[PDB]
Design an enzyme around this catalytic site. Structure first.
Site, PDB file in Angstrom:
ATOM      1  N   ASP A 213      40.799  62.895  34.517  1.00 60.99           N
ATOM      2  CA  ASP A 213      41.146  63.988  33.660  1.00 60.99           C
ATOM      3  C   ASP A 213      42.367  63.621  32.802  1.00 60.99           C
ATOM      4  O   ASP A 213      43.501  63.538  33.286  1.00 60.99           O
ATOM      5  CB  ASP A 213      41.356  65.255  34.493  1.00 60.99           C
TER       6      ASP A 213
HETATM    7 ZN    ZN Z   1      41.357  69.127  32.697  1.00 59.52          ZN
END
Ligand code: ZN
Ligand code: ZN
Ligand code: ZN
Ligand code: ZN
Ligand code: ZN
Ligand code: ZN
Lengths: 325, 325
Positions: A213
């Site tokens: 991420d």
């Molecule tokens: Zn995220």
């Protein structure tokens, strides 16, 4: 030869950049997000207080606009967002394709960090099955319309957090890494996620699901996993001043290992500690936050990506890793 | 009119800026530090690895140089820094003055953060009694050579982490703030510390020693106090997922109140919450960290200074506060 947009730092997270919408290249500052799958821009129609300072999309000013108008609603605890699907030319760099995105019409909640921010919206670089309305990923659409050879992109963050970061589309630039680049198989085509066996000193988690991420400055770990470590820590004199606070010179801290069948990826204390002051700080904070996102799930944000150059390959369903240089 | 140096962002801390050294005006990047009392710069004679991309100080190329060579060495658990005392012209903005400081010769530890950092050294702005070698504070010295009317300085960080912030010397620019400014008396002329009565929901600590520190992006709190607070958070269902993590739309959290005899200063969740991702983030971290630094001691970092424009007055042995506008 490939397409490289420069990434900028906003809050210890370096994955913000510029991309353009429509005929007249309307500009927006996007958070480029590997773990979501739509693009979101503020509409000119946005009635909300947070939209004021933002760049706006105006479909009336672009000849290439294609009316869609299908309504969209995403309610979360932190706030809600509604808007509409529109189609238009979407451009990062010298690459441009017609693409369906979401015009943000109203935005409640998410305060004050949205209006406080210089970023207009999010540019998802995740997978189809995750997207509202089953839209093909932007990079896949470039490939479908032979604007690029391979459905691949890469993220380079510089190892000493000063210089420029790059998002690169269409192939692999050798200049970003030393050593071989190793590929891992996507366990399933939802997010950019891989099966790894995660070790942190004496604690381990076989068959963990590890999510990349770009949008977080944090490293996450399940609660139980962190409880296990706190137990190992308590026993053999691992000295902490509070739960997350220690000395920056703390030799006795273990190394975070993510082990694939072919390669071991590591974060040493040097990489998972942020100092309480920029320089000459006696004190340091564990940049590891325990959170139960999903069974056996760990997240790799920027600290991991500041060390590893990462490649995201749609064609081959793989993520590639290599030491950044 | 008053002299203004611009401040830049590094890692959520906005107190980095430019100061010159000597005849030939050698540029450095300083962490302007309100809680230490020396200026430190890397010497050209600096051996160490971390010194290498750093802007250096060279005696010989400045004619206003005045040898001292007094041995200085400080060790901490995070590492060692030794050097020699030197004196020369020290300039910020238009104001200039001969000031004794430290050239760092060797510097062990403090890695990687030092060498990853684009800042060279720390420009102390505390009190004499804390400095090594019993040296008059810089701004005091500016007053002593009648370079400024008043030995005051101020730090403005902008309420929205958008624009730049300023360190202003010798005066009080009133464009920076709203309402009156409210002065508090120093409990001790060492750091800029004041007696306040700290409240956080139902937990309080009367006559707490409260330190102002421009270099931390954090709010700090004694271990006991934070324990009480989480215990409080237990009994009347405040929804914690882990020990520092909650939803960004949680309004049920208390305001943090620093009460003096005449004024009450406050931080709302609005101010002590940092989101896990920069926009549209469901989760938030408590930017409040527990650490026993000293009896009943609390530190006020950037989260506070972003809401309060602060004034540091040597003439009067006081600190002044007002809403930054
Ligand atoms: Zn995220
Ligand atoms: Zn408004
Ligand atoms: Zn699937
Ligand atoms: Zn194992
Ligand atoms: Zn009280
Ligand atoms: Zn400090």
């Amino acid at each position: 030869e490939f397409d490289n947009v420069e990434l900028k730092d906003l809050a210890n997270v370096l994955s913000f950049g510029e991309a353009k919408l429509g005929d007249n290249g309307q500009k927006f500052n996007f958070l480029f997000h590997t773990a979501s799958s739509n693009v979101w821009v503020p509409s000119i129609k946005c009635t909300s207080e947070s939209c004021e300072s933002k760049n706006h999309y105006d479909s009336s000013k672009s000849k290439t606009y294609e009316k869609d108008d299908t309504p969209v609603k995403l309610t979360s605890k932190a706030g809600t967002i509604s808007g509409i699907f529109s189609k238009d030319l979407v451009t990062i760099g010298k690459l441009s394709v017609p693409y369906k995105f979401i015009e943000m019409t109203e935005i409640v909640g998410f305060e004050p960090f949205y209006s406080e921010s210089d970023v207009d919206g999010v540019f998802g670089l995740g997978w189809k099955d995750l997207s509202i309305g089953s839209i093909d990923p932007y990079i896949v659409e470039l490939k479908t319309q032979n604007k690029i050879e391979q459905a691949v992109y890469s993220i380079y963050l510089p190892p000493e957090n000063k210089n420029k970061g790059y998002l690169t589309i269409g192939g692999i630039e050798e200049r970003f890494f030393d050593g071989p680049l190793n590929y891992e198989k996507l366990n399933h085509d939802l997010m950019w996620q891989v099966d790894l066996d995660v070790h942190f000193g004496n604690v381990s988690s076989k068959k963990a699901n590890v999510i990349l991420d770009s949008a977080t400055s944090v490293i996450t770990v399940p609660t139980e996993f962190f409880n296990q470590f706190v137990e190992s820590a308590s026993v053999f004199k691992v000295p902490f001043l509070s739960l997350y606070v220690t000395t920056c010179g703390n030799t006795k801290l273990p190394t975070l290992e993510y082990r694939s069948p072919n390669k071991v990826y590591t974060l040493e204390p040097k990489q998972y500690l942020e100092p309480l002051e920029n320089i000459f700080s006696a004190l340091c904070m564990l940049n590891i936050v325990p959170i139960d996102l999903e069974k056996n799930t760990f997240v790799l944000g920027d600290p991991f990506m500041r060390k590893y150059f990462t490649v995201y390959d749609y064609d081959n369903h793989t993520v590639g890793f290599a030491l950044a240089k």
